[PDB]
Design an enzyme around this catalytic site. Structure first.
Site, short mmCIF file in Angstrom:
data_model
loop_
_atom_site.label_atom_id
_atom_site.label_comp_id
_atom_site.label_asym_id
_atom_site.label_seq_id
_atom_site.Cartn_x
_atom_site.Cartn_y
_atom_site.Cartn_z
N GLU A 1 0.78 -1.25 0.05
CA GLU A 1 -0.01 -0.07 -0.11
C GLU A 1 0.69 1.21 -0.09
O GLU A 1 0.79 2.03 0.72
CB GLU A 1 -0.92 0.04 0.98
CG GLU A 1 -1.83 -1.29 1.20
CD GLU A 1 -3.25 -1.10 1.93
OE1 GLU A 1 -3.11 -1.62 2.97
OE2 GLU A 1 -4.10 -0.53 1.29
N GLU B 1 -3.92 -10.69 0.78
CA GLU B 1 -4.69 -10.70 1.82
C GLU B 1 -6.25 -10.82 1.73
O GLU B 1 -6.81 -10.16 0.68
CB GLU B 1 -4.52 -9.16 2.58
CG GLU B 1 -3.26 -8.61 2.49
CD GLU B 1 -2.88 -7.39 3.41
OE1 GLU B 1 -4.16 -6.87 3.83
OE2 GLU B 1 -1.88 -6.84 3.30
#
Ligand SMILES: CC(C)S[C@@H]1O[C@H](CO)[C@H](O)[C@H](O)[C@H]1O
Ligand SMILES: CC(C)S[C@@H]1O[C@H](CO)[C@H](O)[C@H](O)[C@H]1O
Ligand SMILES: CC(C)S[C@@H]1O[C@H](CO)[C@H](O)[C@H](O)[C@H]1O
Ligand SMILES: CC(C)S[C@@H]1O[C@H](CO)[C@H](O)[C@H](O)[C@H]1O
Ligand code: NA
Ligand code: NA
Ligand code: NA
Ligand code: NA
Ligand code: NA
Ligand code: NA
Ligand code: NA
Ligand code: NA
Lengths: 989, 989
Positions: B420, B496
């Site tokens: 991210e 994830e």
């Protein structure tokens, strides 16, 4: 199919759609020479938790009372330890399924023994002036009937049931009933026999009811009088005597009194009168006034009036709905003392004694029926009792009892059907019943905006903008052309506006200017007169008010019940001092050259003859000149220019430049009135010679550099932070920018309209304004003057996770005596967060001083607080208060206490005095931090820490009324911007 | 223009965009025969609060240490009382203005004295394997350099600075620096020297770096081996010996080993090897595996593999980022014991020792670089270091050190650029650097969905629906046709998914079915393996975990750091037991007639030869039959049908109707492995003969009526409420409908999509589901059978201010022994609130018993909890647990502990036993109420009150994963509906 549930019969009565059974016809509350015995005093009381377990054990007979205990009557019984008060605003505290009641339903059994002498025979009645919410009445075991309509009176004939000597009166009171569905006012739920219980003899050839009709012909000056009298429903023969007017006439006939003095709120002329039959005489106070609507204006006695109103609930912080008479008289005097001329009995009829006091003291009353079904709105008004035919008889009964009780009082100028009851057939029936029974008073009801069944267009919390369009008659049309034509021909009243919750209300002056400009605007009634705080004693023995949720409620609405102009003990909030100035009945505009003042008489009937006009010139040293000036009486709605004595102008012309002086012209009562003593201030105006701007000290002292400190005259800076660490020996524990304040109640309301409806308080938390951090960028000393230097400290202020910031630069200078501080604020990046602009509460500084403050003095506005859209009541002058009196005792602590428009300030920190001067700033001083203020839910949660928190603001935003109604008006918002401002500081011992 | 600020030079270095200065070239972490001395142990430590006040007092020399104290190194120093841990998820804890640091910035001075013998001469280095976040290193007063990249290694040459005998090593560590802007992982902020400090001799003619290349030709079975060796950056001469393979070769040359056994996570074959020069030898473990991408599939050694992964942070509840080696080994064994075959080092390289353990135990590793700029997303990625050219060198350094350290390990099958970090030029540079340096491993990075610079398409928390479209290759096209063509040819991984926070994760099985169906789906890595709980001791001495905000943080993210499959002490959450079943590597489908089972081998390389297949038949009395069955080895991705012994089928055919029996077939390890003992369960399947429906008792006992009670056999009812007040002597304090449960973490997440995005927890509070009230409608006794009667109690359930309700009817019956309870639930009105449908948590009953429960037994699913979209690990059987072991020790207490699919249940309340039977219901028993559960923020807040709270649910909704990712799938939601269900009750002594 055996049915085994308990108490089905009690519950079936509680669930009834009908009005109470067994009572005599509704009538006026009348002062009679008939014998009366008040049964108020100490009763016996037993509480059971529901109908199904309430005992049917013959208790009504007064024998073998297992489980009773002394309880005063009148009472709201949660106020005496039986259960607890519960507060909801809109939401019902029970499941919404009319007409059914919850299983948990407090049942209070009441019992009293009294003595009835021979004067109560053969005929007497029992009168109950209010029971919340469902009463069943037995006398000597015999059932008299039941009561519905919690704030309405009921009377039961006890002829042949009352026995000579000793009697036992028994009342079963259920807190909740079907009636609860139509009594959803935003207030404490409080069951009990909360008004008078009275035994009244009914002698034969008496008078049961009287309907006074007292009109005024404003062209001829004639009074138009007809007093109707009845017994057993029939018009009877009675004589009417009005001594003062040389009048003897028969009840039933209309006469023309050649010349009467008309009744108004300004001049409440009352003629004493008596109407009498063989067995009974009734005393009346007659006020001659005629109410008319023409040219879309609400007129009394031929003149459009202006309503300066408040919404009056009945609340007492220790007795609940029981308001002692001395508290009533004291609070209406307080209202008069603050220029109030109108009262709305939100949202139920008041105690019957209220009406005579409003006649006498002088208020235009909107008398409102006991009806509110607000809780049905959240389901699209499904099952609304106001449109359910099975509730028609119940609702018409409420209107009938309401009208009959109070129909004789000149002060009642409108009947109101109720409040936030939606729209429906039953409201139409109540309107038709009222218009037919009493055509002399217009009908009010805000809930149906089409205004089909009313005579005035009423709204609540309409914005200033919409009020301006309505005042001009250009609001959007109704779909029905016929209904639109009727409504456009109605005058307009705000039955509720400038919600007075917490810090505020802001925006009051913008409404008032419209009320004056447009004749169709009747004025407005502030929501509301009092806070409903309930006194509570902490473990220590410290008093404070509790509100919703403080009494264990499962559902509640918190501090929305504390939303008043005065607290529950009738101490003024700042909003009342502002309101009094806003609605002052005379306008005084003092000339800039101090030669005179323009005086407009804003009253509707009186001239200026009741007033003495006083002037005073005050300077730093005290009063310099003062006296009285004679004003030929000014007529209502006229104005003149009053010369002041030439000494005043001469004094002004001789003032040196920059020397401050204030000229105040006041209109005070020349003589004692029924509501204040002579000299009481009614209106005022001022002209100010402002102090010149402060002179920065000469930068002649230099910067002394040490390892970990820097010294510039009286200022010691920490070299690590660049911030002052002491000024003239006064320790400075912190100095920094502020952009945030502890949210007011208004800041917690939603910002309606547009894509962002987060409350302002939430916008601020999301943005991090409450948790600013400061990074040091540099510290430079720079060439000043003749060896001295200035010190510039460069910083950037921001918050964790935010890219936006402000650069803040402090430039310090001193000549050894005065410290000069220039502050420059520059936006860095776009102040946007979660997609929406951030707004600031303020642009200022916070000094945290390491000593306590005992006294705060300032030149500016005062004595009370003022924010950009408030503080009308704060006048220019010199003020000085002990620290604790700078604060405001709002029940939920919140931002308060700023003094805007300050030019100079002095804090006494023990022996030393810190003097701040500069261009106009706002001043606040507290013994606790903004985070201690924001965290506190009640006043005992505020804790002093031994420091002084000093706020000097170069800019503030307004406070608005966003808790209910408009937010801060555009001109008072505070978008991020660059700013710069100068202060001088000086410490003395 | 004199500059007077303090510490500007320290701060300017902290604000630097460059990597650390002065360090040797990044290299592999290698096991060498060179002398080494670990400097771990007790150091001296001084904490100062910022750079500007951190002392420059010659402390590095080790003399006159004013203010130092013992501190272990390695350490995260907040874990030892110096300051506090602070937790943020996305938000930075400082103002976002790269590269500047806040004024409050903990500076930890570290110092140690050590002894360097002659073996560390003339050449040695100091190696630091991790410093968070900015280290400056002195040795004997001489500056070696600085460290950037908190979880990356640094090495400093100490030749000519290290002295023989005694030396003083000094390290200044700043918590925050410019590097903090690129290390914004969702985890505890924890400064310190948290990894090994080591002194290593560098003898001449040694080996600095080694790059192993070990490919596998799956067609020929050949290994493809080349071991590169270098010194001072130059390829050197070294001999490579691999004894087991009869290999001696020169470093630098590629050879073809005729036949090797390939390395995989299933079969982690490692050949011991050594590469040596004159002065130094290096020991290696070589695994021959080749990674390839073809046909949009991620292949190892010629086969598409399935990733059964978890995201592994490094956390220890008392030592912070210091994970003791025994905890590492124990937790990877635990992972293997739960069928996990893949690990993602979220979001930074692990301790260097981790890599050998993953090689040996067998995991496919995604090794992730230490880079995350997540906090910049909230400003539209403005100033994102990933696209700022001035950060390029810093970010490339992070990738270089990451790759160099771990490049030799077969278990690393992908490099990840970070997490991210948005999109930008610097990520492209890191990708180009990696592809050139090591073309043998594909590049992973989820942050740029266009996938321009990666080799696999990665996403996080993509819904089941979108995963299904991607698996089929029909996701929407990218705007750029060329980029779209590349991405459509990539395999797809969920880096994830199934966020494992609190109760959950639900929906795991729907993902798994897609992973098996579509070859392009590589699998997924659960977020995450562990909770980051930090042990805290209350005043009493009671242990519990703290989370964000428990350590005084000004900004924090609460319990979002406790979102793991195991707690911080590695005790499994129910989600792990479910996950193990979901990802089990074999599928066993037992035939309905018990004659055999279908067996599919879901592994990629191994056959079924490591497994023993065991069966058992269990009935009420215990095991009835059991043994082992021989299975000819099944090849990967093949299946067969295994006959069971005829006795099993015969037993099943001979069971009387309604007698329950369970056949379980288990695949257990035949022999001890490196990660579990023989008999460890790997996979299982079952077939169940369900107990027949319960027979309502004959309604032959009648209803005995008293004044305030009713008795029906063993049941006493309160006549007022109609509710049971005792059953067989067990006191019943309350019985009523439930529709609500104490919100899970998922229920607190926002319901994204559509017009209503209130969390489900908020929807429920708004709707009043937590505060239901019940009104009694009637109680009837009705003709039963031969004198007996049934009792029907009619009620309506609702909430205050709501018009919607349910009618609930209880019909009781008894023959004296068994109590029969039929419950009927009927919607009344539309269950809509605030404009949106209300959804229920459940349809059930709550019995509040007036005695404590010691033991709970049931027939159903167990032993652990199960909700409609979870409980895959709960198998059919008979279970019995002490009450406290029915609960789940989530750090924030929340709804947990229901046992779905129950057919019978028994609560031991002291001497008596309450037996519940009926159609499938969910069972929960607690010593505290749902409101005590919901109010509790930590486990010590739960308080027992001496009652038993028993929940019997006819319906439950799923738990989903709405805290992050998809909510409850459609088929597991619970919209209001009518329902009816039967129970039998029986009390025994
Ligand atoms: C902690 C105090 C200094 S706060 C102090 O408490 C008082 C009550 O005693 C008043 O409520 C004041 O308004 C408040 O400032
Ligand atoms: C939801 C609100 C805007 S309704 C609002 O609440 C106020 C609370 O003081 C007043 O009681 C007003 O009568 C009412 O309209
Ligand atoms: C008040 C207890 C019965 S609650 C009890 O506390 C325990 C800790 O001692 C565990 O945390 C259990 O899970 C909890 O149920
Ligand atoms: C605002 C969230 C959806 S971002 C979300 O937070 C999660 C918290 O556990 C994980 O850390 C994920 O990495 C992240 O994408
Ligand atoms: Na308003
Ligand atoms: Na209110
Ligand atoms: Na404040
Ligand atoms: Na103040
Ligand atoms: Na997911
Ligand atoms: Na997390
Ligand atoms: Na629960
Ligand atoms: Na349980």
């Amino acid at each position: 199919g055996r049915s085994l549930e308990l108490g089905a019969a009690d519950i079936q009565d509680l669930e009834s759609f009908e009005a109470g059974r067994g009572a005599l016809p509704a009538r006026a509350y009348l002062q009679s020479d008939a014998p009366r015995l008040s049964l108020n005093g100490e009763w016996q009381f037993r509480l059971s938790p529901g109908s199904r377990v309430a005992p049917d054990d013959g208790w009504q007979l007064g024998e073998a009372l297992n489980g009773f205990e002394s309880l005063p009557v009148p009472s709201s019984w949660p106020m005496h330890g039986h259960g607890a008060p519960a507060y909801t605003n809109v939401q019902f505290p029970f499941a919404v399924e009319p007409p059914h009641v919850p299983e948990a339903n407090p049942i209070g059994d009441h019992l009293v023994v009294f003595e009835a002498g021979p004067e109560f025979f053969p005929h007497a009645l029992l009168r109950f002036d209010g029971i919340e919410s469902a009463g069943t009445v037995w006398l000597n075991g015999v059932e008299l009937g039941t009561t519905r309509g919690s704030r309405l009176a009921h009377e039961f004939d006890v002829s042949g049931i009352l026995e000579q000597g000793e009697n036992t009166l028994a009342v079963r009171v259920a807190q909740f009933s079907a009636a609860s569905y139509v009594e959803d006012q935003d207030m404490w739920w409080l069951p009990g026999i909360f008004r008078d219980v009275t035994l009244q003899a009914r002698p034969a050839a008496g008078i049961d009811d009287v309907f006074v009709h007292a009109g005024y012909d404003h062209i001829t000056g004639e009074g138009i009088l007809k007093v109707e009298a009845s017994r057993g429903g029939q018009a009877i023969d009675a004589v009417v005597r009005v001594p003062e007017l040389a009048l003897e006439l028969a009840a039933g006939t209309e006469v023309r009194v050649p010349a009467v003095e008309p009744w108004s709120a300004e001049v409440p002329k009352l003629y004493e009168a008596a109407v009498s039959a063989a067995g009974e005489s009734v005393a009346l106070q007659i006020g001659f006034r005629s109410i008319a609507i023409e040219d879309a204006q609400f007129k009394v006695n031929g003149r459009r009036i202006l309503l300066r109103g408040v919404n009056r609930h009945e609340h007492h912080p220790r007795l609940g709905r029981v308001v002692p008479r001395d508290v009533v008289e004291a609070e209406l005097r307080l209202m008069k003392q603050h220029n109030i001329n109108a009262i709305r009995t939100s949202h139920y009829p008041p105690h019957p004694q209220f009406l005579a006091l409003a006649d006498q003291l002088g208020f235009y009353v909107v008398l409102e029926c006991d009806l509110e079904t607000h809780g049905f709105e959240s389901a699209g008004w499904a099952q609304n009792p106001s449109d359910d035919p099975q509730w028609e008889d119940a609702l018409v009964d409420r209107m009938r009892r309401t009208v009959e009780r109070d129909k004789n009082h000149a002060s009642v100028v409108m009947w109101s059907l109720g409040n936030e009851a939606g729209t429906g057939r039953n409201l139409a029936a109540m309107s038709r019943w009222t218009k037919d029974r009493d055509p002399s008073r217009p009908i009010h009801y805000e809930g149906d905006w089409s205004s089909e069944h009313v005579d005035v267009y009423s709204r609540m919390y309409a914005s200033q903008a919409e009020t301006a369009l309505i005042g001009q008659g250009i609001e959007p049309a109704l779909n029905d052309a016929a209904l639109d034509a009727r409504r456009r021909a109605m005058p307009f009243v705000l039955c509720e506006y400038v919600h007075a919750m917490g810090n505020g209300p802001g925006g009051m002056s913008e409404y008032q200017a419209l009320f004056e400009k447009y004749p169709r605007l009747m004025g407005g009634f502030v929501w509301e007169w009092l806070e409903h705080g309930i006194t509570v004693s902490t473990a220590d023995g410290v008093d404070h008010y509790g509100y919703g949720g403080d009494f264990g409620e499962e559902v509640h609405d918190g501090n929305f019940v504390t939303d008043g102009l005065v607290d529950a003990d009738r101490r003024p909030r700042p909003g009342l001092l502002d309101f009094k100035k806003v609605i002052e009945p005379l306008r005084i505009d003092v000339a800039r050259d101090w030669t005179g003042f323009t005086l407009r008489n804003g009253q509707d009937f009186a001239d200026t003859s009741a007033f003495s006009f006083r002037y005073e010139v005050e300077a730093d040293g005290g009063a310099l000149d003062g006296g009285t000036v004679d004003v030929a009486p000014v007529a209502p709605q006229s104005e003149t220019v009053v010369e002041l004595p030439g000494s005043v102008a001469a004094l002004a012309a001789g003032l040196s430049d920059g020397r401050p002086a204030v000229l105040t012209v006041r209109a005070v009562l020349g003589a004692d009135s029924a509501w204040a003593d002579a000299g009481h201030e009614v209106a005022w105006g001022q002209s100010v010679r402002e102090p010149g701007a402060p002179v920065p000290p000469a930068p002649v002292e230099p910067v002394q550099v040490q390892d970990s400190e820097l010294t510039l005259g009286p200022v010691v800076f920490s070299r690590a932070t660049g911030m002052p660490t002491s000024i003239g020996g006064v320790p400075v524990e912190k100095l920094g920018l502020t952009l945030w304040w502890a949210p007011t109640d208004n800041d917690l309301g939603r910002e309606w309209g547009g894509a962002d409806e987060r409350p302002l308080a939430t916008q601020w938390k999301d943005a991090g304004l409450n948790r600013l951090h400061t990074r040091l960028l540099g510290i430079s000393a720079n060439p000043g003057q003749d060896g001295g230097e200035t010190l510039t400290v460069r910083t950037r202020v921001s918050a964790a996770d935010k890219q936006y910031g402000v650069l803040v630069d402090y430039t310090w200078s001193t000549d050894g005596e005065t410290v000069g501080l220039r502050t420059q604020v520059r936006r860095d990046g776009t102040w946007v967060n979660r997609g929406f602009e951030v707004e600031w509460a303020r642009i200022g500084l916070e000094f945290v001083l390491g000593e306590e403050t005992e006294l705060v003095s300032w030149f500016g506005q005062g004595p009370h607080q003022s924010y950009p859209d408030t503080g009308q009541g704060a006048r220019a002058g010199w003020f000085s208060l002990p620290l604790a009196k700078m604060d405001v005792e709002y029940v939920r602590p919140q931002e308060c206490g700023a003094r805007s428009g300050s030019r100079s300030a002095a804090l006494q920190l023990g022996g030393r005095t810190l003097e701040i001067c500069g261009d106009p700033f706002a001043l606040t001083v507290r013994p606790y931090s903004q985070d201690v203020l924001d965290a506190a839910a009640h006043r005992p949660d505020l804790k002093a820490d031994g420091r002084t928190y000093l706020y000097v603001d170069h800019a503030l935003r307004g406070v608005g009324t966003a808790a209910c109604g408009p937010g801060v008006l555009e001109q008072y918002r505070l978008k991020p911007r660059d700013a710069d401002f100068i202060l001088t500081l000086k410490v003395r011992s």
